[PDB]
Design a protein around this ligand. Structure first.
Ligand SMILES: *[C@@H]1O[C@H](CO)[C@@H](O)[C@H](O)[C@H]1NC(C)=O
Ligand SMILES: *[C@@H]1O[C@H](CO)[C@@H](O)[C@H](O)[C@H]1NC(C)=O
Ligand SMILES: *[C@@H]1O[C@H](CO)[C@@H](O)[C@H](O)[C@H]1NC(C)=O
Ligand SMILES: *[C@@H]1O[C@H](CO)[C@@H](O)[C@H](O)[C@H]1NC(C)=O
Ligand SMILES: *[C@@H]1O[C@H](CO)[C@@H](O)[C@H](O)[C@H]1NC(C)=O
Ligand SMILES: *[C@@H]1O[C@H](CO)[C@@H](O)[C@H](O)[C@H]1NC(C)=O
Lengths: 377, 377, 377
């Protein structure tokens, strides 16, 4: 593939991708427990533990019901003084002490209630999607690290992934899973996770071609070539990416979609330019620009191009039909009737809670009558 | 494009979309803090604050680990009486008071614990996806309003969006972001958000064409035209939408996919009908109906059509090969062997909590012995 | 369609799918209330209820703002002794009792605060997506069971779904919804849910064809056929699935994409093999294998095939151009320069909380001076 001789034919070099073939996934089963084991002094904590269980039931019961509906489709003077003293003792012993003791277990109960609530939130974060959609979920990073015991070296080694594969796999969301079974009373869900096996085709590189209009002897012409062509070593072939997943780094296809390329097209791509079926534009709309990673290419030889906020027209020095516009002059270009903006940077911000100041507890002072008793003795 | 003369050829007018070209996104960085600054009487709150920190660590550590694995891919008698009194004072001063004072800080601790838990839930709602999937997330509306300080007029002004663009952008989910870095101990994540720059092509309208079978001199025929044709002013061109995002209002493509249209096709679309490559149907299955926004069009001149629950056959008055069925007669139509239902309305419902009634607190009465002391004095 | 005679031409039978046409969805409106009705002793609970309301406001206000921005686009000695006794009574009555009574309502307040927090978490689980993305969300299973009162028999009956439809609908995520209106002060959102109406085309089966290279008289050849062909009874037609949703069980298309098939292709598919436009491979890359549900087919007659970890070469007995490799011998195959792995099983694991042990409450002993009073009397 020779680009220098295609540029003058109106074909602009586009993005480059590697080429991978997707095979059957590896499977790993994980059981997620929603109700923690809390034991000891059950009579003290009981009330908060039961409300928690109802939260879990309300979340899991709809999963069980859906799985049953789909059962066939799921894959798997001294006397008076003493009387006063005893009366006071009575009120302390019958009212004050019993209340304080009850408050001590209300406190433990609430502490457990908070701890349980946070545990649910941790699960909601990691296995949220699993609970929300029993079929075909996207697996989170927290769920993955749990699966491999927080060891990504082991993850890569077992799957045979490079750092580049982990990145594009997470980008596309190719790690998926399903709930196969649940136990509502126990608070258990059985989640099955599928980890894809990707294979790299050696030296196979996919090259995008972006044709735009150009002028020649007269009139306006467009050259017609496949948008995507596959090059390996010295071989060229046609591909169809409409059924493939495309990431920034590679094209991931199930099966191998390469097909034989015609002689005439091979000729053009390699620099012949003898044929390159160019077609005359008479009563059709055709493109006059192409965009690649922020670069703007345009046929400013045919149409009127302008740089905004400099109020300056754009022209060509000839020797080419396609010019690259310089992004260092302005943010907005006009090509024909279309205004093209660029990806400028906006200032940094933050999200946070307001600062919180706590006040002191109410503290009861000690009762000290030593100075009075001393004067009675 | 002249529809009246295409109807008699078996081509039914379909949906209409505008046409837009997607360029490089604008970038804005936001730092999200998961641990709030709570200060004052640290000895009182400490215990609940530490459990919260462990929740945050369990959520963020897997993000840090994944980012490191992907480091190369991430973009960025009086004496006895006194003895009794002092004994009672002792039990109050050594047992009752110390317990009450401890309960006062247990209460403050629990209050902080609840407040912290709710803060996490707010973050889980707005930045949930960011934490779950470090690469290529969909940005929530809460995260967006945070970015623009709850001012959507500013949002639209900076990006150059109309209300129609904000709607279709949220519909498709074109606002994306990534975590670039984290600090597990600090509880910080650095989230980068990409806001797309869409440009409108003036007067460019995409029109869907839906061919069905029809009869003529004899036998059964189907006319073959591209499903999508692009019309601007007086110009027609071919497009390929298999690589574009399609919303209810518009087709959003990266780069411009328009290509020159052949003379013969232009002729047909504009009403010539001289060629319109019609092909004979001999041993193939072909469509006899078309659906558009609930409208059902059918070739009831060729096949048998019926209106269900009226038990009434459907017929044509001729003068056309395509008839539109009236949705005011029945909900289910039969065309040939296929039963076609319509989008009926189901009754309104609600989701809510059961009403909760609270009981009163236990209240300790005051100790009043004034009437007894008065009789001793 | 006759496969035995296509195998020798290099065409391998692929996956089989049913064929369905998607029509207008049924609509059901549900109102979700985020603030529960808690009443009684309002002076005791008030403080925690107000903090909860602020959580709800922070989540809903951005939804209201977005809806307003999009308003035009949204679809809808004895005396001294008595003095000591009264002094002690004073400290109990003025310090100890008031504090204990306050702790009793602090306890009720905290209990309500926990209960409210959990309710929000339940909503975040079921209607999370609705709050996060006001436009075009995926509906969760919890939201669906709420809509049908936890009765999936009613769900299937009303929609006319079979268990197979519920499964593939949840798999693809075809149940969608939008927030049409909100009330921030009331804590209400109005969520509209669209349930798709799918219709099955009788006997319509889509068959995938996977061509690979083969040898014949000499040189290397590839036969070119459409990847997907539609067969009904005795009729064959061409389809285009690039615009359709594909599930494991079926192809779900809006409208009907079948078009007439050419005579020559019908001939080949039915076993003629007279034409089958076979093309010579001269300077192109072509596939030498095909993958289907873990099965690996390969042209080991043309290239070199090996079984890894057995260190054994793979050969053919002839009588065929395509051989199926046996997955019971090894996990990794080499075909040409490409290493193909298989979906092996990884061991079962679990996610859970550490077991928690609770200690006892602090219990205040009763004050017993009966033995001393008895010696004074
Ligand atoms: C727990 O409460 C029950 C009454 O529901 C009581 O019978 C039992 O003895 C209590 N157990 C303890 C250890 O307090
Ligand atoms: C008061 O008298 C009691 C008699 O038992 C004695 O124990 C106590 O220490 C005396 N208090 C003072 C201040 O002398
Ligand atoms: C906090 O607790 C520590 C013991 O862990 C103690 O040394 C310190 O004095 C306490 N500070 C306050 C203000 O109570
Ligand atoms: C009881 O006697 C004490 C002596 O100090 C006095 O202060 C108190 O008011 C008297 N109480 C009554 C009810 O007379
Ligand atoms: C509630 O508190 C207010 C003061 O904010 C007070 O006026 C009112 O009487 C109290 N009501 C009850 C039932 O305690
Ligand atoms: C002490 O004397 C009082 C006088 O009212 C009497 O009620 C109480 O029972 C006596 N206590 C004992 C242990 O005798």
């Amino acid at each position: 593939l020779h680009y220098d001789s295609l540029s003058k034919v109106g074909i602009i070099k586009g993005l480059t991708y590697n080429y991978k073939i997707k095979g059957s996934p590896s499977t790993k089963l994980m059981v997620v427990k929603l109700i923690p084991n809390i034991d000891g002094v059950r009579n003290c904590t009981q009330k908060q533990f039961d409300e928690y269980k109802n939260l879990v039931k309300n979340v899991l019961e709809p999963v069980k019901l859906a799985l049953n509906a789909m059962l066939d489709n799921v894959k798997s003077a001294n006397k008076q003084t003493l009387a006063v003293i005893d009366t006071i003792r009575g009120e302390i012993n019958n009212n004050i002490i019993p209340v304080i003791n009850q408050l001590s277990c209300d406190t433990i109960g609430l502490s457990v209630g908070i701890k349980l609530t946070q545990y649910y939130s941790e699960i909601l974060t990691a296995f949220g999607p699993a609970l929300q959609n029993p079929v075909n979920t996207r697996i989170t990073i927290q769920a993955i690290s749990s699966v491999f015991n927080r060891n990504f070296d082991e993850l890569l080694k077992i799957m045979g992934y490079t750092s580049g594969d982990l990145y594009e796999i997470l980008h596309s969301g190719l790690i998926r899973g399903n709930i196969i079974d649940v136990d509502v009373e126990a608070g258990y869900i059985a989640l099955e996770i599928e980890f894809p096996n990707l294979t790299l085709v050696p030296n196979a590189v996919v090259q995008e071609l972006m044709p735009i209009s150009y002028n020649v002897d007269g009139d306006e012409w467009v050259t017609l070539v496949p948008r995507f062509v596959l090059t390996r070593t010295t071989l060229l072939s046609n591909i169809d990416t409409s059924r493939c997943t495309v990431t920034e780094s590679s094209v991931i296809c199930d099966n191998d979609y390469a097909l034989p390329m015609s002689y005439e097209l091979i000729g053009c791509l390699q620099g012949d330019t003898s044929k390159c079926a160019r077609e005359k534009v008479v009563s059709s709309y055709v493109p006059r620009f192409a965009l690649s990673d922020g670069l703007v290419y345009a046929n400013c030889l045919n149409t009127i191009c302008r740089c905004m906020d400099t109020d300056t027209p754009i022209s060509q020095s000839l020797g080419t039909t396609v010019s690259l516009l310089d992004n260092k002059k302005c943010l907005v270009y006009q090509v024909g009737d279309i205004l093209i903006s660029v990806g400028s940077y906006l200032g940094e911000g933050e999200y946070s809670a307001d600062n919180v100041e706590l006040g002191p507890p109410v503290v009861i002072d000690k009762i000290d009558i030593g100075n009075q008793l001393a004067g009675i003795n």
